[PDB]
Design a binder for these strands. Structure first.
Lengths: 124, 208, 306, 210, 129
RNA sequence: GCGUUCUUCGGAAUGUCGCGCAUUGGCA
RNA sequence: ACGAGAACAUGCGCGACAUUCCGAAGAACG
């Protein structure tokens, strides 16, 4: 997917690593509802990409991902915990990486990473 | 031996949902996906669903025998139309209802209007008043599927009765629902027949 | 099976959400116009990218983190309203009990994009009324509703005082008729039986809990404004926000004190932050327009015709 | 002696389920798998399947004799085409259908778009009394698949080749209008014979007309 | 069979599957209240990748199969968090550990053996009920 | 505005055939 | 100048028939 600091690769195991690192409460006070709202924001563009057969991300999908970045910034502003979650998970940069790749495979990998984040947050 | 073809379209009225059994789905999305044709990734009404629903509705309309246990115990006309597997009394199924693929006209209409072929209806289940979120993928209203039904003329004299039963079954299916979730509204559908033609044999389909 | 057309007359705003919560950062609310234009995010983002205000949009988001009303940003950038209509999907009349909006819920729409009342919700309301069969009953999905009848309403909580909640929801306007088709077998259900059960359930809901809210001073003001119609028969509570006394069988299958005790216990085990702290049984357990008249969330009237 | 080769492809329409060997299936896997070529694990249409289906359709079209029990009691045209085993009247089958293997073109088309050759279809069986549904996973070949089919006709009587090939065309038309597989009455087995390359592989016989 | 070893050291196989199902059998709630439908959902999550590998003949697990196995670990964790009974089932049966083991091994045979182990778990859970 | 459910309980194939005829064989 | 010499385990054949991915569930609770 992408490369984190010190050569770390974005992965579902990396999602578990982030969840266990930020566990103390999670991500300095992150709740399940905020992460749920972020996953809901992911869901619409995920379904749009899933329905589309073309491997290359469609233009409306790319604009949806840009608006997803904007909404992530807004959520980070609204709640400091969401900002901490975003900066620890590097999801905002992952959206830009997906846009750069312009491939369905990278988008679904990022969606699976976010899904792993949600699953491990629920598990821990 | 005459093969009579009934080609037409079937258009959803409230939203059809024939489930595919669940699949790899992101958390909170694609809870119960609709069955789709693997090749075109397009929603499809299986011929199995249409035939089974029509057979069951016809059986209810005619009247099930008391304490019926198997589908090979329906009315003789239903057994001659939809087939039978009874030991020693096997009856060939004259009706060969096939898969109702997504019509190209409706597919291009949806593409023109920038509408998804399937709507992910987000519903829940109140308990304590605790809900159970779920995303059921049901076919978008106004989607037409082309249905193709083969009728075999096993007995010429019985063709009129069999086609009257077919008309009654179509009327019931339009009146009743198709697929799953009918009591909640989703699954009501409508038939629009295009032409009944006898592709094979000397039988005349103009009267039919 | 016996078939009846079902008419739902909306006497109070009814919201059937689509599982998505939208914020003021996503739409544009004009208080002077009193209209909220629902903006689709991708087109707005591309518009700002073309106009060069996207960096300005990020800076505006950074400056005021909690409040990021898109209308204020557009007014600051002096973007023309005809340019606004490019990325506006539709517009909705807004009624606030307060300033501005906080968090908007959207009504459910089909894949075609038409507003409709899902038959699942209506059948669930009927089942809860009749709870105490449910396969013969087949409530069909409603006919598509005109977008004009859909407007944004404000949620107000009545706890001894009228308190506007920072939560607006798109709802079907009062006086709108919704049509369904209901089919039932004779043996399992009777139309007279289900109608009588609806009437008795509404009477029990009125006697057990509604009087207690009327006795509250906020309830008294609600009655004075016109929140309770004189007509309110067959009454169904469907929209999101009707309340715990509705959509549950506690007030129907149990005595008033027993039902209140059970509801208090389940609220305490569910919501310790509010009812768990309180150690005594409350007296009662547990919408505004541009005009003077008040409304009750989700209240409706049902009629059946063969 | 002349042998005429009919090489072409059968293109699936609704998806055919030629049931397999009923091997031990995993719990929750396909309860009824399709017959597959063991070497390539690709679904195939057995030559026996095509031969039996088209022979039965042709016999029905011609008309079964009253109280017919054995296959050798078919019409003389069907016996001449597909063969007979009646004691003292053993007619050689002029038609030698071969198993229709998964075509390389359709295999590449399925390798593209990340499509599996066989799809697991979920079905149920609503009870007539308890109204309970019994789940069933049936493997079915994908609708977009194609199987390269190979038939060989033996020229035993040059005068009857035209009539036999007319019967073959009638049977192919019947099979296109009918299904080829299990569950066709429920919509599994519709096909079409798109490509047909009739050439005389052996002998001086001319198959241009055929 | 011959998949891995538990923390105690007991070998993991079909017999171990029967043994753990018997141990968690309580009268009949199994694995601390694990309903059959949750187990069937886990089995279908298994069965997707099982079909993907069963059609294929490559000895090494394909990259898409490995990604689906990691997603299977994610789904197992999500089900463990959402339902305590599923968490107990996975912990006692060591399913997630076997998934990472087959990911390490990267063999069609070991994946088929793990799927057979899960199938034995489901079969014995249905039998001991 | 915040928080909680994100899918749940059952069915997971069943029944019918599972080789038959002809020669080899038997009896005449 | 082999208990040998010739001798196709061959001919006929639809893994098919019957089967709704369904039953029940209010995006709603504070």
């Amino acid at each position: 997917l992408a490369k984190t600091k010190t050569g770390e690769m974005i992965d579902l195991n990396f999602a578990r690593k982030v969840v266990e690192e930020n566990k103390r409460v999670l991500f300095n006070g992150l709740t399940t509802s905020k992460l749920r709202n972020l996953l809901e924001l992911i869901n619409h563009v995920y379904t749009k990409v899933y329905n589309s057969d073309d491997t290359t991300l469609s233009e409306d999908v790319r604009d949806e991902l840009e608006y997803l970045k904007v909404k992530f910034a807004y959520e980070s502003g609204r709640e400091p915990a969401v900002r901490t979650f975003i900066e620890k998970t590097y999801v905002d940069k992952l959206v830009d990486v997906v846009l750069k790749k312009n491939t369905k495979k990278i988008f679904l990998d990022y969606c699976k990473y976010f899904e792993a984040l949600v699953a491990y947050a629920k598990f821990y | 031996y005459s093969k009579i073809r009934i080609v037409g379209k079937i258009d959803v009225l409230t939203g059809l949902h024939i489930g595919g059994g669940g699949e790899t789905s992101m958390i909170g999305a694609i809870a119960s996906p609709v069955v789709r044709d693997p090749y075109s990734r397009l929603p499809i009404i299986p011929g199995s669903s249409i035939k089974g629903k029509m057979r069951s509705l016809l059986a209810k309309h005619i009247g099930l025998i008391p304490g019926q246990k198997m589908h090979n115990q329906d009315a003789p006309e239903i057994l001659r139309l939809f087939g039978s597997s009874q030991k020693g009394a096997i009856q060939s199924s004259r009706l060969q209802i096939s898969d109702a693929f997504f019509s190209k006209a409706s597919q291009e209409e949806f593409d023109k209007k920038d509408l998804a072929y399937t709507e992910t209806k987000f519903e829940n289940t109140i308990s304590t008043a605790v809900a159970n979120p779920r995303q059921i993928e049901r076919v978008t209203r106004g989607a037409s599927f082309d249905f193709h039904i083969i009728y075999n003329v096993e007995n010429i004299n019985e063709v009129m009765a069999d086609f009257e039963n077919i008309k009654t079954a179509i009327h019931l299916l339009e009146n009743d629902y198709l697929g799953g979730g009918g009591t909640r509204g989703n699954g009501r559908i409508r038939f629009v027949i295009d032409s009944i033609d006898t592709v094979v044999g000397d039988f005349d389909s103009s009267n039919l | 099976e016996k078939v009846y057309q079902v008419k739902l007359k909306v006497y109070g705003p009814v919201h059937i959400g689509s599982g998505k919560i939208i914020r003021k950062q996503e739409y544009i609310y004009d208080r002077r116009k009193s209209l909220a234009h629902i903006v689709d995010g991708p087109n707005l983002v591309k518009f700002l990218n073309k106009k060069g205000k996207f960096t300005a949009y990020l800076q505006y988001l950074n400056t005021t983190k909690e409040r990021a009303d898109l209308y204020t940003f557009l007014r600051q950038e002096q973007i023309d309203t005809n340019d606004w209509k490019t990325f506006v999907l539709y517009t909705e009349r807004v009624n606030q009990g307060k300033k501005g909006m906080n968090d908007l819920h959207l009504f459910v729409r089909d894949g075609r994009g038409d507003l409709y009342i899902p038959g699942s919700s209506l059948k669930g309301a009927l089942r809860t009324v009749l709870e105490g069969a449910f396969h013969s009953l087949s409530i069909s999905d409603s006919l598509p509703i005109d977008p004009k009848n859909l407007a944004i309403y404000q949620k107000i909580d009545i706890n001894k005082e009228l308190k506007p909640m920072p939560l607006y929801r798109e709802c079907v306007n009062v006086g709108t008729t919704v049509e369904f088709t209901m089919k039932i077998n004779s043996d399992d259900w009777t139309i007279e039986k289900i109608e009588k059960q609806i009437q008795q359930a509404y009477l029990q809901y009125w006697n057990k809990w509604f009087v207690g809210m009327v006795t509250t001073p906020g309830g008294k003001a609600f009655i004075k404004g016109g929140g309770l119609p004189s007509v309110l028969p067959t009454v169904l509570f469907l929209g999101g926000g009707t309340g715990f006394p509705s959509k549950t069988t506690h007030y129907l299958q149990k005595p008033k004190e027993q039902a209140q005790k059970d509801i208090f216990a389940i609220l305490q085990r569910r919501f310790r932050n509010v009812y768990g702290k309180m150690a005594t049984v409350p007296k009662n357990v547990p919408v505004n327009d541009s005009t003077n008249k008040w409304y009750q969330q989700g209240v409706c009237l049902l009629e059946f015709q063969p």
